[PDB]
Here is the input.
Amino acid sequence: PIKKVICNGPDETIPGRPTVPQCCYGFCVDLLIKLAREMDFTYEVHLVADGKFGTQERVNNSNAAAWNGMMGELLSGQADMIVAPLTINNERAQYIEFSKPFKYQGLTILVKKEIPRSTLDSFMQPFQSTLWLLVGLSVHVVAVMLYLLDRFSLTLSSAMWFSWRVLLNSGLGEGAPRSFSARILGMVWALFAMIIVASYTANLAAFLVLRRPEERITGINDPRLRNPSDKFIYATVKQ
Amino acid sequence: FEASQDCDLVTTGELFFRSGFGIGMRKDSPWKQEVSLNILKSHENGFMEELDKTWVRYQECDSRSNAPATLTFENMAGVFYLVAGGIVAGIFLIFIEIAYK
Amino acid sequence: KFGTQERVNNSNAAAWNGMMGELLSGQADMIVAPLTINNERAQYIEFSKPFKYQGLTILVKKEIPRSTLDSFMQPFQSTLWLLVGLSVHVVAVMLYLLDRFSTLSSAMWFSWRVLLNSGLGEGAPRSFSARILGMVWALFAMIIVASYTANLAAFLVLRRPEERITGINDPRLRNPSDKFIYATVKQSSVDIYFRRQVELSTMYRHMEKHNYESAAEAIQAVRDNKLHAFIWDSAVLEFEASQDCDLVTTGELFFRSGFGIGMRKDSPWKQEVSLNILKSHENGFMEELDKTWVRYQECDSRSNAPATLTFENMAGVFYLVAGGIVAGIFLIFIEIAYK
Amino acid sequence: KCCKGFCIDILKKLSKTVKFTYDLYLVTNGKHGKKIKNVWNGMIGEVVYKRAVMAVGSLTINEERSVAVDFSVPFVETGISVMVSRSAGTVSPSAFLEPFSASVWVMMFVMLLLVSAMAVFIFEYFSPVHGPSFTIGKAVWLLWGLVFNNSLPVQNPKGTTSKIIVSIWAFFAVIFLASYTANLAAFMIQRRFVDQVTGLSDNKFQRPHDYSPPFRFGTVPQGSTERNIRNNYPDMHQYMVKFHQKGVQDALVSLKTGKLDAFIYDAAVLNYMAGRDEGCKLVTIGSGYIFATTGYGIALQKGSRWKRPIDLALLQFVGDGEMEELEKLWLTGICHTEKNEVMSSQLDIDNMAGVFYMLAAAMALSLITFVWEHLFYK
Amino acid sequence: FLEPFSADVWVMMFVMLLIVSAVAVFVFEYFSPVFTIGKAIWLLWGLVFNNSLPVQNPKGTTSKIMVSVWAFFAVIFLASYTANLAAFMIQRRYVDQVSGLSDKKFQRPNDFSPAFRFGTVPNGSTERNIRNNYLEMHSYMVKFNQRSVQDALLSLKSGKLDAFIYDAAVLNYMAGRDEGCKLVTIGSGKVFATTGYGIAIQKDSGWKRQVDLAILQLFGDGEMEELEALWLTGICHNEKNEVMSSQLDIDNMAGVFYMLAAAMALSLITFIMEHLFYK
Ligand SMILES: *[C@@H]1O[C@H](CO)[C@@H](O[C@@H]2O[C@H](CO)[C@@H](O)[C@H](O)[C@H]2NC(C)=O)[C@H](O)[C@H]1NC(C)=O
Ligand SMILES: C[C@]12N[C@H](Cc3ccccc31)c1ccccc12
Ligand SMILES: N[C@@H](CCC(=O)O)C(=O)O
Here is the structure.
């Protein structure tokens, strides 16, 4: 069962309503319950006034203490113990007592999710389509060239099928070359067709490249730390 | 944790200003000696792992689904649409060609 | 060595000597050489505007392997590649079973074809159902070939790099050991850096114990592989890096310096010299000369080529062809035997 | 004897920061404190005996040390951990391109349906009005072969329309194969090879006896963890005691030689070991969370408190860039673990087996069709 | 696939055919009392390059099988050929067009039919140097001169100008600190007129040597490296940049296509030649 405790709540999102009873639970609440049971003590929980962890403020009117947010509340004696993800640091340790750390953590940066990539048909346009249009046209001319001599001393469709046999790689084999010269022609053109498809296997190879380098931003090395870009806004939590 | 629950958000890789959490009490609190010993015991016992694992483990973000098909395959749908369309014209046209010769 | 100020034996106080002391001494009025320009020297003598801006890098690198036998091997080692071929042959037995209640040489040959796209002639068993396996086995055969190709590319991944290049910020260089037999030239300006850098004292000595009288021996040690690493300023080193390519420079030049003639103080010409070399830069002369000599040397980058290595397995195939046709006379004997 | 390291450097920081002169020596009896019977052993002994005011080192923090003495810094993150040289392999050949399956597999079935229409156009052409009718079945078998990398003798279809329809299909098959190999190309990436062991909860650790294969996990003698193990699994601690080693290099070599299956220690140090491996064959568990959470602590006389005063100096030191300088100075580790990738010359035989299981299933299916003919209806 | 294509593979392929041709004629003739032609050449062609060959298959047992083995190995090579080209696809130096300026392309825009463009900030040491050594460049570039480095950048960035020329340190920092990494330092950014920042003094009477000492003290301390990382740090570290799946404006395959056309022409006139053999 999720253990919950009633914790006095401060001001709500709506106007006023500073005084309220609310429900608290989570990592730190389970820890409190364990500590209380272990050291045998009773307690009452409340959410910190002004919603802050705690930092001293130097000069608002007279010089001021590290009374900001949650931490000062403790100084007043209203809170006898702070049970939250309260960072242990030199500044605070000078005034209060921290237990041995219940969690080790480091600062990082949160940014929106990265953009995606296009589909294969879209990918085809950059290289596959133009070549397909130009080369497909080229095959017919090659088929016509062999026949020229053959004609001199659906044949065209058969020639196209023979030349297409390479492209789709169907190798329907509906027709064969008429003459030895054509075969030399076939020897010429057939080899060229093989090279053309092997280059299509190079196109096949080209599909894998769509790997994206993208980007990451260094804590100190990156330009943004170097300048709060006017266009690029970054921030943290006050106090 | 947030990045593990909301996949539209991600963290920058570098971790800087390494720091850690603790229970806070006034310096003269009589529960200070007891509070840490308890924290240490919970770390060594595994209680701390149960809480972090119990709460933190609920959500994760992965690169599952690879790259093949999926979104890339959607235009393949277009390709599939293109095969079906071509055959119909040939029927009547082919019949006309047969009639001619 | 050019020389550095050092303890003079019992006296313990002495002039830098070598090329420079001769200069103080007046043996050589003016010094023309590749001399880096530094403050420790600078107080003693006038220096011209630096001619070059070379930075220290570490000139070393050894051979990077590319398996000749690795690509096919993916099958060889797996050992399910051969065995499954035999099971392709076994599928013939299943087909015979299909034949029952509705040639061996042709079947085995047919199985071989699916691995090899033989397209011999007869085709699938009379049973339609039996023929379904043909689609399956050829399916997987196809898949396997393609998968292999992908794993062939996995070999191509390469991308295994020593990655010990960043010495200044590199972890291995900082904590020296017997695996880091590292040096410089005995009495080299970097020794001043190690000297003054108490931070590098460890390295100072580590380095010192392995130092050389000259670059020819220092480069050679790495070439001879006597010493795993060598440290010197880039201008001398990069040219060599081009010269062999067996050896490589790594990381980012550190401790940048200008090259300027060394002369005894008050030389009424150094200023003119500075103007003259300035002009040499201005007119592109300095520039023209640097290209002229350095440009002549060049080496290949990280570009991959097959290099006729893996082709030998095919050499083996052709040897097997010969064996094949020899066996062939007995194969035709079989027809003759059934005479 | 000269001393090195970031602690040494911190001590230098402390010479200046707390402005206190110090005398440093090495412990003789027991290294890190060991408690046996009535009297404790190690640096802690010299802290108790008054020989030492403060004890410094890689010492781990525990509650017992806490009753006796204290440390208010917790500068580093360390935990019990294991270094395993293992690997990650492909599963189900990218599920036979499962992604294509949601849309692609159905479309293949749909593709067969397109074929029937093509045959219908074709049948009329073939017979305006020997036994070519086998072509449609053959064409499907035939069409299917052309779909995957050709390699089908099949039958020669004649109908004029089929050649065009076949070409449209062939084109598709070709680009399919392109995407197939791109799926395959993507997998090369998927051939991620990361160490495959679990955390402390893994059964290989919890119930070692059950596995047929012989493997053993162990840790250094007189460590703080021994106790944790005895307060986790007593039996496991006994097993560790049976296979005891003593020096880092013992474990290291054992791991490199396979004499030791894997090794648990302070992760911080183990990370440093990865920081210094020759050949990079060792890694942390999963991400590397130790599963025991602690930081180094420095001893002080229980009565003594310079630590409270000492604490202040220490934090800013945390805040200061140097800790990271010391990190870069001493903790810099070679071969940063970019999701590791590698290529196998042994390929995959168990993934291959997965493929073969699919294959075997098909064999069973053909036996079923045999049965159908075997018991063919009258 | 160029090394393999260069020597061993083709000769070996001829031998397999030839071995088969000898065996096929003798064996085939052995098989049938009542031939290796072009069809055999096609077979070397069919087995060797991803099939797609419809002409023939030899009617014999020993050679045909041997070739199926060849084909299988050859397929491996084909696969590797694809991988070899994939290697090319793995990375590419998308920096090919470089204006050295010692090339003389910059020396004249007019030699190149489309108008080229490059400019620099006026009242600079660069402009004065240019006017001193290279007049034509100055007289031409006066039109391309720009108001300010941000504005010069406006001429480069939004188009309407191709190349920009300026101080190397600023151009290197600018390359690092840039919205788009498309702009890259020329070559290695190795600069002609190699120079450095200069500090003024009055004349022979001044701080002189003591002041210089301080400078080289800085190098020894190593502060400049830190200050470089902080102030001179640059975005998009300059690794060998790569491009993938680029518009395929083949150039060498275009050459191959031309090889094809030429080879055809040869065979056509070969047929004519042959025909004449008769007369
Ligand atoms: C460099 O800048 C100086 C000063 O701004 C320019 O000198 C001015 O040139 C303009 C030309 O329109 C004259 O109207 C002014 O009388 C000049 N003196 C000024 C404005 O101080 C100079 O022209 C610039 N370099 C060039 C482009 O020649
Ligand atoms: C044509 C092809 N047949 C096999 C495997 C395959 C896989 C995907 C697409 C294409 C091919 C092959 C090997 C080498 C090049 C081209 C191919
Ligand atoms: N890390 C402690 C104890 C070892 C352990 O945790 O097992 C030491 O250095 O001795």
Remarks:
- The CA atoms of residues 30 and 36 of chain B lie 12 Å apart.
- The first strand of chain B starts at residue 9 and ends at 11.
- Strands of chain B lie at 9-11, 16-21, 24-26.
